[PDB]
Amino acid sequence: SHEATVEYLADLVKEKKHLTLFPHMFSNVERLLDDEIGRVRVALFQTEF
Amino acid sequence: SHEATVEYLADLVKEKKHLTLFPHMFSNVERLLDDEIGRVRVALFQTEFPRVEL
Q: Found in which tissues (chain B)?
């Protein structure tokens, strides 16, 4: 899976913002993106674990 | 992860087709979606053939 960087997080959050214009057309995609954003955020703060 | 059903796969594929309307505008979304389609196809195949190694 993609390396966890803050720039990556930024890009993901930005794509999500764009998809939100068509919420019910991309409902599965939006969940996958939410999962990846969640995973990335957690990763950023657990590099020592 | 979301349960692999043929209907779910259909939904993902339909969303993938909708995304083609927006060329080069959703690169990470496209990758995540392709990854999920791949995982669901593999899961469907493995449920069909439980003894096979992928």
A: Expressed in proximal and distal oocytes in female worms but is eliminated from proximal oocytes following mating.
Of A18, A27, A29, nearest to B33 by CB-CB distance is: A29
Minimum distance, in Å, between the CA of residue A19 and any CA atom of chain B: 9
* Residue B24 phi, psi (nearest 5): 65, 25
Q: In this complex, do A15 and B36 lie within 8 Å of one another by their Cβ atoms?
A: no
Nearest in space to B26 (alpha carbons), one of A5, A42, A20:
A20
d(CA A38, CA A35): 5
Residue-range domains of chain B with CATH: 1-54 (1.20.5.4010)
Tell me the two tokens of residue B48.
């069909």
Where do we find the tokens 């992928």? B54
Cβ of B28 within 8 Å of Cβ of A15? The answer is yes
Residue B5 and residue B37 in contact, taking contact as beta carbons nearer than 8 Å: no
